[PDB]
Amino acid sequence: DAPEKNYERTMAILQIESEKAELRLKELEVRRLMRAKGDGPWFQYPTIDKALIDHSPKATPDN
Amino acid sequence: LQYGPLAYILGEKTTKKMTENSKLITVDGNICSGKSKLAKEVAEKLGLKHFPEAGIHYADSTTGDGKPLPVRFSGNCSLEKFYDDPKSNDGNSYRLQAWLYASRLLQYADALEHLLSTGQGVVLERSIYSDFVFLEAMYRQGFIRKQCVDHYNQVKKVTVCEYLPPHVVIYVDVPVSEVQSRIQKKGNPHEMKITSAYLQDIENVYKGTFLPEMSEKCEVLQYSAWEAEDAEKVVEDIQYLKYDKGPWLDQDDRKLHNLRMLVQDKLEVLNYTSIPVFLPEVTIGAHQSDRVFQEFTELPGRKYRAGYNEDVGDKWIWLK
Amino acid sequence: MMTYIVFILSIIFVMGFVGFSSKPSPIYGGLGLIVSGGVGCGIVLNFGGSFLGLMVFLIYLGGMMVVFGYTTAMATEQYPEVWVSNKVVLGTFITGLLMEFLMVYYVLKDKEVEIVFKFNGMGDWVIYDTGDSGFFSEEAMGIAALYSYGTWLVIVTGWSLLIGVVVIMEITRGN
Amino acid sequence: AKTLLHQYWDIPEGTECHRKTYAATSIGGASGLVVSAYSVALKTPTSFLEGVARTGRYTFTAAAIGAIFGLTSCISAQVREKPDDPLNYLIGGCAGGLTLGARTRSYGIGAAACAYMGLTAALVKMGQLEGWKVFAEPKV
Amino acid sequence: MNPIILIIILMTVMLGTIIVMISTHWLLIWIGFEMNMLAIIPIMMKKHNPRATEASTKYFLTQSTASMLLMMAIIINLMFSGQWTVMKLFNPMASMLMTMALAMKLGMAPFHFWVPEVTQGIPLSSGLILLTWQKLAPMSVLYQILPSINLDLILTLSILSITIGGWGGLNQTQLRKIMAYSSIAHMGWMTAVLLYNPTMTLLNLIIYIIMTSTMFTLFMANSTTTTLSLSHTWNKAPIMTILVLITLLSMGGLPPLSGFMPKWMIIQEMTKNDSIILPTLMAITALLNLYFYMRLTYSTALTMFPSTNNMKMKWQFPTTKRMTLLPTMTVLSTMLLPLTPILSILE
Amino acid sequence: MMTGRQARAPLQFLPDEARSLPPPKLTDPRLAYIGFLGYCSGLIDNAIRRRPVLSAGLHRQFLYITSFVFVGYYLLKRQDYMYAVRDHDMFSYIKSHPEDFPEKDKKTYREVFEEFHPVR
Amino acid sequence: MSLVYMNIMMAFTVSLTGLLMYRSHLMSSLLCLEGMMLSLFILATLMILNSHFTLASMMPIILLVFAACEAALGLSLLVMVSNTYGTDYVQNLNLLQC
Amino acid sequence: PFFDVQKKLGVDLDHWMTIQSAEQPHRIPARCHAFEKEWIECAHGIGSIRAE
Amino acid sequence: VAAFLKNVWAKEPVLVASFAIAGLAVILPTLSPYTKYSLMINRATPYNYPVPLRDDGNMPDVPSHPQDPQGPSLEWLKRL
Ligand SMILES: CCCCCCCCCCCCCCCCCC(=O)OC[C@H](COP(=O)(O)OCCN)OC(=O)CCCCCCCCCCCCCCCCC
Ligand SMILES: CCCCCCCCCCCCCCCCCC(=O)OC[C@H](COP(=O)(O)OCCN)OC(=O)CCCCCCCCCCCCCCCCC
Ligand SMILES: Nc1ncnc2c1ncn2[C@@H]1O[C@H](COP(=O)(O)O)[C@@H](O)[C@H]1O
């Protein structure tokens, strides 16, 4: 293979691997912030649905 | 496969073909009791299927083409050299005894499968309940050791407790002198060397150990030498019996189904025949069994499963 | 002291549990658990649990009669222990009694106690309702709705009882 | 007894000998009572005096381990004038290993206990220095 | 057993585990565990020998104690939360009690004292169901309450299960107690990464179920119960020695086999959270499991132990046993590592 | 981890948004590896039942190959879907929070002073 | 919390330790399991009748049912111990030690 | 693995005994009905970590 | 079906009466017109209070008084 061939192939490999490394570091930091806060689409542990609540007038009014 | 739990669920109940003719019969006796023909007579008046006596080569006759295999593949022992040399060092005696018990267990499995699948009774010769008595003669003449008897009783304890005793067991009273006279008139050059106390102890363990336990779990019909020669005598004395003894009565479709599922797996039948109890008469080593097994691979039709052999001319292997 | 009536019935409840928890013999175990179950429907019935306390009375009476039949049939020795035959029964029996009256003495002195949770020492007359329930006891309507809302609960409970019968017939077959 | 490990580690090294030795002895005694409870549980003593003699034996064994461990650690940290140094705990763990060997009446157990407990105490000092967490919080 | 009754009992076991898996209510979780126990008792008692009665007695006592602790945790959640959603528990006392209940249902150490006895007493298929299908329901309940599970308790139970299940398998020549202490070690492996990333816990669960089903299916296909009865396999069926070799080297965690897949991923999810000591000790303790796996491969495949005479008859019969999914389980138990990123289907 | 995302579409293997993604090729090397797993399952199934391993059951080996390819194709589609949802949620979260992720001043090495450590 | 919850949890712990420490007799531990179910019944029913959450008032009934729906199982698992052995001691159940 | 069959098939197996504010027999209120309604509508959708 | 019915009516007649009563109790509430009257009696029984509504202005079937003609009637219950 040519030296230009191997050289520019090496540069494409380095671009792809540096992008994957920066995105893995972003992946770690995003998981850290979402487990710390819980504001993102991940780590939404389930709570009670608010559609189950009976909104009709009940028997006694003290409720 | 042919039978399983699905066919039992889909209506094949084993008491749809359990009639009064379903009588598993076994004719016991000494070496030359005139009984080996008599079983055929009991086979040819009651309309039953005769199994011959399981020698070394019973499993050789069941699977494959049925020709007699060489002795180094099956048993690796001898009966003639047992008769010439009962007190050998290499242990022809217990090796031949254990191989005969394995062959008779396969014979009894085939008998129960034919009986529980075809509705036709099977006439055996010297079934597995009448095998250990021969071991006792080989213990009463000093042919084997105590550890071989312990090994055989462990094997028979773990193999016979899952079966049933037969319906009718025929026993033949021939005294020792008439057995010896028929041996001498046979002219068999190896059979003549059998000692007399061996045969007397065969008769003693017949009368004192076999029949005091089988008479309560099957039905005895004890015949002498002269009355075991008429066929219709023994046939009709089977034909008018009142069957209450034995564990054949408390058997429904479920228990006979579990027996039939145990029987039709022949490797599960023969699973604990060769238990790993290290005994010098039966333990065949690594390279010897390796050489004999790689020669068994080269036997014609024996390399693959029973419909996957081009050397015997099997068709459609590439669609099986 | 009379306002502590659910407390007093619950002291009898714990005393019955000490009585059959030292395991003297299942005859006297049946006695102690009949006493504890019979005051269980004195504890829970002073809340409004008429039906739902009578059930834990009745089902446990059937249970202790069957338990009697088995401990008379299979679980019987020659000298059954009353409570005082073995020393190791009576020691932990007296231990349970003095430890229960120890925490009684600690809860009627301080009116607060904490074994791991925190418990008031005033009687449980304070925690009731000041309202009416109309022409129905509310727990009777709740167990009446076992057939209206609770469809899946009825299905799985009937299937569990069915296969419990089948399981027990497959176990006590012997072969 | 997590608070026992607190009031062991809530005292600076090379300052107070007898209180640290008492805290290490108490931690050793708690470990010995755990081993004593499982020993009278999983293997039945043929007498109650058999069981309490085994309980006292295991209790004094682990208490002597903790005592000579913390004592040698504190004395070496004082007399070397290096408080945050794992060689002090290394010598303390080896002294506890020879303690366990003298209580089990065997030399090779004592030498192996010297070596492996010295490695263990070195790991404890380094995990106390760099903040190594064994039961670490899930955070990412 | 009547095969209709056996099919109804197996459907009831599956129904109990499904009722644990699909229900949002704590009482239905408890009813699912009750149904699962009640319908797995006759699977342990299919052959009616006193060893099975001892095994079923010990199993029923342990699972009944666990069910009592589970219902007390449920009632304490009802106290401190006033509701019934299967979600995080609203009390650390209730979380501790439910963790104890699920740990007794899994047989995690030091509640592991029933798994080798019960696994030895019962037949091979019942042991397979006990070691695979009974590890689906309490791991489901542990999956659904992980924001309330205390960290130190579940890590202590996990690493204690790993160490004790590593040591317990070294002194057993019986195959089923080997698989039982392997089960204790692998449940420790699963629950150690539960609070960190539970998708890897589900991955470890599924890979362990595939490997354990491969091992018990080989044990049923050769009808072997001990190491010494497995020793004659090269004379009976030589390809089965290759299969038990590759599966026993898979379960220890040797690359490039699939059992290196969960373990390494567990370390991949424990060094993320600044915990380097604990997966190191787990990786060291995996060598004990791998050691008695190497012992079983030395006995079976890599050498040739001496056989006996009557094997010469068993040469003449093919295995007519229903070897259900055995090549599929073999291939998915040894050659799965290049598809390590398949774990995202469990997210 | 992502259990809040897959709670509005429960028990859906591939959602409606999963079709927006390019599917794996029919010459996918991962699916070809699963086809090799099917070929090995066919060979093991002919080996454990003492059949001629390369000749017996052409339909049997071909159905093993077809079955593993048919399972593995949908498994690879769910794999691609879940990693795509992971990157989509990551990038939308990074875009939604600018104050959590500073853009560094990407210096050059003529200002950054590294400590040299010679080998001698 | 209130006073009666102390004694019901105390009865739970007493029946727990009675179950969790044997006396070489298995029927007496079946009784301790049924006692633990009694304590669970009373505690859940006190909580439900206190909160006036009536719809789970069917919950103790179901609870009590599954009590005997395992305890009768133990009875079927008792006689299979006591048909093998003349007694039902727990030291007859040590053949799974090898 | 929370296989949510009840939301998949649309069936309603045990979403009625779950809370004290659900549909009751003859509209019997609970003594913490208003507080549990406020806590459920306060903590719906915002997840456990923010809801605690 | 008649011959086996006579046979089981000879052998086990209590079981025949049991299965007959059970089968009729299963099938017969789907062949009777009174079941709608059962449901309407059960839902026309006012346990709670008939909670009034705020008059926003336009409810053409809601009364202002019990003796107003609009609303559900129960004269069918008194006739039947
Ligand atoms: C995180 C949640 C994940 C949920 C995944 C759910 C997947 C399906 C369920 C898997 C769990 C195991 C369930 C089955 C356990 C064993 C059932 C059983 O005992 O079946 C009886 C049968 C008997 O066969 P035989 O050998 O003839 O019997 C001898 C007589 N005793 O057969 C046997 O004993 C042989 C084994 C039968 C089952 C093998 C197949 C399932 C497990 C292996 C993986 C196969 C690959 C495909 C599925 C991958 C996912 C598990
Ligand atoms: C359809 C509605 C739902 C039906 C199922 C639910 C019924 C609920 C009522 C309670 C029933 C509980 C007991 C049921 C037991 C049935 C099984 C049985 O007893 O079979 C055996 C019996 C013969 O007795 P044997 O086996 O000889 O006993 C040994 C010595 N006594 O065999 C018999 O006696 C034969 C009994 C079957 C034939 C009865 C036919 C009755 C027909 C009545 C008119 C038609 C009614 C419509 C429904 C017909 C349903 C078949
Ligand atoms: N279990 C056994 N042990 C020793 N010899 C046996 C046994 N069973 C059969 N034989 C011999 O088998 C031969 C039977 O041949 P025949 O009676 O002519 O069919 C006799 O020589 C018997 O001694």
Side-chain angles (χ1 to χ4, degrees):
Chain A
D1 292 333
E4 298 88 4
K5 180 175 179 180
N6 192 6
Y7 189 84
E8 295 177 351
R9 179 174 60 190
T10 301
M11 288 183 69
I13 290 163
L14 287 175
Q15 183 188 5
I16 296 170
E17 292 290 327
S18 66
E19 288 187 355
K20 291 197 288 183
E22 292 292 329
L23 290 181
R24 288 183 184 94
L25 290 175
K26 286 184 179 181
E27 191 265 338
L28 285 174
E29 183 66 30
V30 162
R31 287 181 66 189
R32 190 179 69 85
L33 289 176
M34 288 180 180
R35 189 182 289 274
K37 292 186 288 183
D39 56 350
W42 299 347
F43 294 97
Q44 295 293 319
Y45 295 105
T47 61
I48 300 171
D49 194 1
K50 67 181 178 67
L52 294 174
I53 298 171
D54 193 0
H55 293 88
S56 296
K58 302 294 188 292
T60 67
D62 290 333
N63 52 3
Chain B
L1 274 299
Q2 186 67 40
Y3 183 78
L6 182 62
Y8 178 75
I9 290 167
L10 286 175
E12 185 180 1
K13 299 295 191 292
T14 185
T15 54
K16 289 184 179 179
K17 60 182 72 66
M18 188 63 68
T19 185
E20 58 91 20
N21 201 5
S22 297
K23 298 297 182 182
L24 178 62
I25 300 171
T26 298
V27 182
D28 290 329
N30 203 359
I31 292 174
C32 293
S33 295
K35 66 176 182 64
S36 328
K37 62 182 180 67
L38 174 62
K40 296 194 268 78
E41 294 177 354
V42 178
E44 69 188 1
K45 300 293 182 182
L46 290 172
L48 303 181
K49 188 174 179 66
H50 186 272
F51 285 167
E53 186 177 4
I56 292 171
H57 304 286
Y58 184 77
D60 300 332
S61 65
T62 58
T63 61
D65 52 354
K67 293 183 176 68
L69 270 293
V71 296
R72 67 188 184 275
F73 293 103
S74 66
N76 199 359
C77 62
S78 179
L79 183 61
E80 294 86 3
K81 195 259 183 65
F82 171 73
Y83 287 158
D84 293 333
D85 193 358
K87 295 181 185 293
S88 179
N89 195 3
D90 56 354
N92 195 5
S93 298
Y94 180 71
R95 188 172 64 247
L96 183 271
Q97 181 66 42
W99 184 259
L100 285 179
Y101 178 69
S103 297
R104 293 183 189 278
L105 185 58
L106 185 65
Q107 183 186 4
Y108 183 72
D110 287 330
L112 282 183
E113 185 172 359
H114 183 73
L115 181 59
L116 292 172
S117 67
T118 65
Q120 184 177 2
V122 180
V123 176
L124 294 171
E125 289 180 354
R126 291 183 181 93
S127 66
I128 59 174
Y129 291 94
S130 69
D131 186 74
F132 78 105
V133 296
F134 292 99
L135 187 81
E136 299 294 328
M138 295 165 67
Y139 185 72
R140 286 185 178 180
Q141 293 299 110
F143 295 164
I144 55 173
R145 292 183 292 113
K146 181 177 173 66
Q147 288 84 17
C148 296
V149 178
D150 292 332
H151 181 271
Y152 181 76
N153 287 320
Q154 288 182 356
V155 171
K156 188 174 179 176
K157 182 175 173 63
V158 301
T159 55
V160 82
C161 66
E162 294 292 327
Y163 293 100
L164 297 174
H167 291 91
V168 176
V169 169
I170 301 166
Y171 177 66
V172 178
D173 283 330
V174 179
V176 181
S177 66
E178 183 66 29
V179 176
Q180 292 177 358
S181 296
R182 291 179 182 175
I183 287 168
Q184 296 297 322
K185 290 187 263 75
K186 180 65 71 177
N188 196 0
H190 299 286
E191 192 178 2
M192 295 184 288
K193 292 183 182 179
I194 297 168
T195 59
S196 179
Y198 185 77
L199 297 175
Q200 187 62 255
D201 290 329
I202 287 171
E203 186 175 2
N204 287 319
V205 182
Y206 274 158
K207 295 183 185 296
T209 304
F210 179 76
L211 296 175
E213 72 175 3
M214 292 297 289
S215 65
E216 290 85 4
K217 65 175 68 64
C218 74
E219 293 182 353
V220 294
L221 292 175
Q222 186 174 1
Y223 298 99
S224 66
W226 60 88
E227 62 187 0
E229 298 294 326
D230 190 75
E232 294 178 353
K233 175 74 169 64
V234 180
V235 164
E236 184 171 356
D237 290 330
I238 292 170
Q239 283 178 354
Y240 291 103
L241 294 172
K242 297 294 187 291
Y243 296 95
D244 57 352
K245 294 188 264 76
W248 287 95
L249 277 74
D250 53 354
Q251 295 292 320
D252 53 355
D253 290 329
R254 182 183 65 84
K255 295 176 183 178
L256 294 174
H257 171 74
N258 294 321
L259 182 63
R260 187 174 179 180
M261 291 297 290
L262 180 67
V263 161
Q264 67 179 355
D265 193 2
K266 301 295 185 290
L267 291 176
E268 185 67 30
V269 169
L270 300 170
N271 190 9
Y272 297 103
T273 58
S274 69
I275 53 171
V277 171
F278 295 105
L279 191 66
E281 285 84 3
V282 296
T283 300
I284 307 299
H287 297 285
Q288 184 177 2
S289 293
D290 196 358
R291 189 261 299 165
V292 174
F293 184 74
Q294 296 298 322
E295 289 183 353
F296 184 80
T297 306
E298 297 292 328
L299 288 173
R302 301 288 183 182
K303 189 176 190 295
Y304 294 106
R305 187 177 288 271
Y308 293 94
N309 291 318
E310 290 182 354
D311 57 356
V312 305
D314 294 332
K315 278 80 175 176
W316 296 103
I317 295 172
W318 60 275
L319 284 175
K320 287 187 285 186
Chain C
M1 193 68 203
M2 191 63 204
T3 63
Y4 297 96
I5 187 66
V6 185
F7 174 73
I8 294 169
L9 291 170
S10 195
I11 300 309
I12 302 170
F13 189 77
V14 181
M15 283 175 66
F17 268 91
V18 173
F20 81 98
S21 295
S22 66
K23 297 184 289 291
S25 178
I27 309 292
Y28 295 93
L31 173 63
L33 182 48
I34 280 170
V35 172
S36 69
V39 297
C41 67
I43 297 166
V44 79
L45 187 145
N46 292 320
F47 288 88
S50 296
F51 180 78
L52 190 47
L54 263 293
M55 295 311 109
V56 77
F57 189 66
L58 192 148
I59 302 302
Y60 279 161
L61 291 179
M64 297 308 107
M65 184 266 291
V66 174
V67 165
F68 188 89
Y70 281 102
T71 189
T72 311
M74 282 79 169
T76 309
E77 64 181 1
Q78 187 179 1
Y79 296 100
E81 301 177 354
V82 177
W83 289 277
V84 301
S85 295
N86 210 167
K87 62 181 74 173
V88 71
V89 175
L90 183 60
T92 187
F93 176 71
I94 296 168
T95 302
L97 289 177
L98 67 91
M99 184 170 68
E100 176 61 27
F101 287 106
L102 185 273
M103 67 190 70
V104 170
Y105 180 76
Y106 285 173
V107 74
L108 272 74
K109 184 266 297 294
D110 202 5
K111 304 297 287 183
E112 291 175 353
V113 77
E114 188 172 2
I115 293 96
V116 173
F117 301 111
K118 181 172 85 273
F119 300 103
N120 194 4
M122 286 178 68
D124 55 353
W125 61 273
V126 294
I127 59 173
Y128 289 170
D129 194 1
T130 62
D132 56 352
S133 297
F135 280 92
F136 52 91
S137 65
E138 298 182 359
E139 55 91 19
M141 295 299 106
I143 309 169
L146 188 274
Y147 289 92
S148 67
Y149 289 157
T151 67
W152 180 253
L153 189 62
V154 162
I155 292 170
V156 300
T157 308
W159 182 258
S160 293
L161 293 175
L162 176 69
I163 68 101
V165 173
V166 175
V167 159
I168 287 165
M169 292 181 71
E170 292 293 325
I171 291 167
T172 61
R173 187 175 290 173
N175 52 4
Chain D
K2 181 178 172 65
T3 183
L4 271 299
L5 275 68
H6 283 89
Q7 67 182 359
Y8 182 78
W9 290 103
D10 288 329
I11 296 168
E13 294 293 328
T15 60
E16 187 173 0
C17 184
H18 295 92
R19 184 66 65 193
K20 290 291 288 296
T21 303
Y22 179 74
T25 307
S26 64
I27 293 170
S31 296
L33 288 174
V34 170
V35 176
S36 297
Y38 286 103
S39 179
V40 302
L42 281 308
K43 281 91 174 64
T44 303
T46 63
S47 178
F48 181 72
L49 271 299
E50 180 73 26
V52 301
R54 289 178 64 189
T55 299
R57 186 178 69 245
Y58 292 158
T59 300
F60 180 72
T61 300
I65 289 170
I68 296 175
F69 176 76
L71 183 62
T72 304
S73 295
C74 182
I75 291 300
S76 63
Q78 289 179 357
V79 303
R80 291 182 66 250
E81 290 182 353
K82 290 175 95 288
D84 50 357
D85 189 71
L87 185 273
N88 292 317
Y89 285 0
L90 184 64
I91 299 173
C94 187
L98 270 298
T99 301
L100 185 273
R103 292 297 298 161
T104 55
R105 274 76 173 176
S106 61
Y107 292 99
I109 304 300
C114 162
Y116 288 99
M117 287 173 66
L119 290 174
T120 300
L123 291 171
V124 170
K125 187 65 175 69
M126 296 169 194
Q128 195 270 333
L129 285 174
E130 278 86 6
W132 297 350
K133 300 297 289 184
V134 53
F135 293 158
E137 178 68 28
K139 63 184 288 291
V140 305
Chain E
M1 190 181 288
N2 194 359
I4 297 298
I5 302 301
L6 183 62
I7 289 171
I8 293 299
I9 283 169
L10 290 178
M11 293 301 107
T12 307
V13 175
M14 291 178 69
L15 184 63
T17 304
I18 286 170
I19 285 169
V20 177
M21 286 182 182
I22 73 172
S23 66
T24 68
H25 197 273
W26 290 107
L27 184 66
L28 270 298
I29 298 296
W30 186 69
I31 288 168
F33 283 113
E34 290 290 329
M35 186 185 292
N36 196 0
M37 177 185 69
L38 181 64
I40 204 172
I41 293 299
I43 302 299
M44 292 180 182
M45 295 184 73
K46 191 183 288 184
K47 301 302 292 295
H48 296 285
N49 51 0
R51 294 180 183 271
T53 64
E54 177 180 357
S56 295
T57 300
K58 294 181 181 180
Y59 178 76
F60 177 73
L61 289 169
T62 56
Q63 296 300 107
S64 295
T65 310
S67 177
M68 299 300 172
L69 292 173
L70 180 63
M71 179 49 70
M72 178 50 70
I74 287 169
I75 294 167
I76 292 171
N77 192 11
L78 180 65
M79 286 182 180
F80 290 93
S81 68
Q83 51 84 26
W84 293 90
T85 309
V86 182
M87 61 181 180
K88 68 171 288 184
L89 292 172
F90 292 94
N91 192 3
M93 184 69 200
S95 296
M96 184 183 75
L97 290 175
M98 191 171 291
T99 306
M100 293 298 173
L102 296 170
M104 293 181 72
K105 284 182 180 293
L106 294 174
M108 293 175 63
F111 303 105
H112 72 283
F113 291 108
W114 60 273
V115 184
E117 291 84 2
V118 178
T119 309
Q120 179 64 41
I122 66 177
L124 292 173
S125 66
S126 60
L128 176 58
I129 294 170
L130 174 61
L131 294 177
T132 61
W133 186 260
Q134 294 294 315
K135 306 298 188 293
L136 289 174
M139 292 309 294
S140 298
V141 184
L142 286 171
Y143 179 77
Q144 295 172 1
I145 66 167
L146 63 90
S148 286
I149 300 172
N150 195 1
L151 181 66
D152 300 332
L153 176 59
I154 195 67
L155 289 178
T156 301
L157 290 170
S158 301
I159 65 98
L160 193 60
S161 296
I162 290 171
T163 59
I164 297 174
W167 284 298
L170 298 176
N171 201 1
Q172 301 301 323
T173 61
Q174 298 292 317
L175 296 170
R176 288 173 286 178
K177 289 184 178 179
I178 287 168
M179 295 304 293
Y181 287 105
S182 178
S183 178
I184 299 164
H186 285 91
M187 297 313 295
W189 278 103
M190 298 174 199
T191 61
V193 74
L194 182 65
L195 299 181
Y196 296 101
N197 196 358
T199 304
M200 299 298 176
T201 303
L202 298 178
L203 177 63
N204 193 4
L205 178 59
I206 292 171
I207 296 299
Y208 175 74
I209 285 168
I210 293 170
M211 294 184 291
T212 309
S213 295
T214 306
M215 287 300 293
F216 280 104
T217 305
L218 287 168
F219 287 167
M220 292 181 286
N222 292 319
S223 290
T224 58
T225 61
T226 66
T227 304
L228 195 63
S229 65
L230 187 62
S231 67
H232 295 174
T233 309
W234 63 271
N235 207 170
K236 186 177 184 293
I239 190 66
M240 300 296 173
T241 59
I242 298 171
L243 298 179
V244 300
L245 176 65
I246 62 173
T247 308
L248 285 164
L249 292 178
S250 177
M251 292 182 71
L254 288 177
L257 301 173
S258 72
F260 182 71
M261 180 189 293
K263 173 176 76 174
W264 168 53
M265 284 293 105
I266 291 169
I267 301 169
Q268 191 266 334
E269 294 291 328
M270 291 183 74
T271 64
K272 287 186 185 292
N273 287 309
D274 292 331
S275 68
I276 312 297
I277 300 170
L278 197 66
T280 298
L281 269 68
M282 288 161 62
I284 293 300
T285 317
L287 295 176
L288 283 77
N289 296 115
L290 183 54
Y291 184 73
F292 55 82
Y293 294 156
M294 285 298 296
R295 177 177 290 164
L296 292 175
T297 60
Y298 283 165
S299 67
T300 302
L302 298 174
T303 59
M304 291 186 284
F305 282 178
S307 65
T308 60
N309 189 15
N310 290 318
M311 186 63 71
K312 294 180 179 67
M313 189 170 287
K314 291 190 285 185
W315 297 346
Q316 294 177 356
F317 295 99
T319 59
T320 62
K321 296 179 185 291
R322 296 289 299 272
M323 295 184 287
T324 300
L325 290 174
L326 183 60
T328 301
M329 290 181 289
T330 299
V331 170
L332 291 176
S333 65
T334 58
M335 290 183 284
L336 195 57
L337 189 64
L339 295 174
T340 305
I342 205 67
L343 56 88
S344 67
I345 72 171
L346 296 175
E347 290 287 334
Chain F
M1 182 179 71
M2 297 187 286
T3 186
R5 179 65 183 270
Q6 290 84 19
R8 276 79 180 271
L11 290 176
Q12 290 183 358
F13 188 76
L14 292 170
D16 186 76
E17 63 185 2
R19 296 176 66 189
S20 297
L21 294 169
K25 293 180 181 179
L26 297 177
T27 61
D28 195 4
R30 294 177 293 172
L31 189 63
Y33 176 71
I34 302 169
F36 180 72
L37 298 182
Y39 184 73
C40 288
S41 294
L43 297 182
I44 292 172
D45 188 77
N46 285 316
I48 62 171
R49 288 182 176 91
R50 292 178 65 249
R51 287 189 288 267
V53 182
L54 296 168
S55 297
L58 294 174
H59 67 280
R60 187 177 295 112
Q61 291 180 355
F62 190 72
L63 187 58
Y64 273 110
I65 291 173
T66 300
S67 66
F68 280 8
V69 169
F70 182 75
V71 175
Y73 179 69
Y74 293 100
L75 293 179
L76 288 171
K77 289 181 74 178
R78 185 171 175 84
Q79 176 176 356
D80 290 333
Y81 174 71
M82 295 302 290
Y83 288 113
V85 170
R86 197 268 307 276
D87 276 328
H88 183 269
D89 294 333
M90 188 195 301
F91 285 161
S92 67
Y93 184 76
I94 290 172
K95 186 178 73 68
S96 67
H97 289 83
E99 69 270 14
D100 289 329
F101 296 96
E103 292 293 327
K104 300 290 185 181
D105 289 330
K106 294 188 263 76
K107 295 169 72 175
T108 58
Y109 291 96
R110 64 188 293 271
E111 293 90 4
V112 177
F113 179 73
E114 297 181 354
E115 183 180 1
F116 183 72
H117 295 282
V119 177
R120 68 171 71 100
Chain G
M1 51 202 72
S2 180
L3 175 58
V4 63
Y5 296 99
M6 177 189 74
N7 290 317
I8 303 301
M9 291 181 184
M10 188 63 205
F12 180 75
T13 57
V14 168
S15 59
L16 174 61
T17 60
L19 187 273
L20 199 55
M21 297 179 75
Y22 286 85
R23 282 194 65 250
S24 295
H25 203 193
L26 193 64
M27 182 60 70
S28 296
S29 69
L30 269 295
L31 283 174
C32 291
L33 289 172
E34 289 169 348
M36 295 182 75
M37 286 306 295
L38 173 59
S39 180
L40 291 171
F41 191 90
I42 297 299
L43 191 62
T45 313
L46 261 60
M47 185 64 202
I48 289 165
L49 292 175
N50 203 172
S51 295
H52 288 80
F53 173 49
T54 180
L55 188 54
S57 292
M58 67 184 77
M59 177 267 168
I61 292 294
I62 295 300
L63 181 65
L64 187 64
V65 168
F66 283 95
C69 193
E70 63 183 358
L73 178 62
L75 296 178
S76 66
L77 202 59
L78 194 276
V79 295
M80 291 295 107
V81 173
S82 182
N83 289 320
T84 300
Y85 300 98
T87 61
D88 56 350
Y89 292 163
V90 308
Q91 67 270 20
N92 291 318
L93 298 173
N94 53 4
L95 274 73
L96 294 176
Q97 65 182 357
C98 299
Chain H
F2 184 74
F3 296 105
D4 197 0
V5 175
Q6 301 172 355
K7 189 178 182 293
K8 174 67 177 176
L9 295 176
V11 296
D12 193 359
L13 294 175
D14 51 356
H15 295 283
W16 52 270
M17 203 194 289
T18 303
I19 56 171
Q20 298 178 356
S21 297
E23 185 176 0
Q24 294 289 321
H26 298 285
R27 295 292 183 269
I28 294 167
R31 290 183 68 188
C32 297
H33 176 74
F35 289 102
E36 188 160 355
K37 191 267 289 293
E38 290 293 327
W39 183 65
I40 291 168
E41 289 183 354
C42 190
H44 175 74
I46 62 172
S48 176
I49 301 170
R50 294 181 66 245
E52 290 294 325
Chain I
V1 70
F4 179 71
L5 183 63
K6 181 176 72 68
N7 194 1
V8 70
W9 185 249
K11 294 188 289 183
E12 300 291 326
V14 183
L15 292 173
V16 181
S18 300
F19 282 105
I21 293 168
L24 291 176
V26 169
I27 67 100
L28 196 61
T30 60
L31 279 74
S32 178
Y34 292 156
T35 308
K36 185 175 89 275
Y37 295 97
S38 302
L39 189 65
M40 289 173 71
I41 285 171
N42 287 318
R43 70 177 65 253
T45 301
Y47 291 98
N48 292 320
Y49 190 82
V51 177
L53 299 176
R54 180 181 291 275
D55 195 1
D56 54 355
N58 292 318
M59 287 181 282
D61 293 332
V62 177
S64 296
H65 195 276
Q67 289 181 356
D68 290 333
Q70 64 271 17
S73 177
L74 291 178
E75 295 292 328
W76 60 270
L77 179 60
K78 295 180 73 67
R79 272 87 55 83
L80 288 171

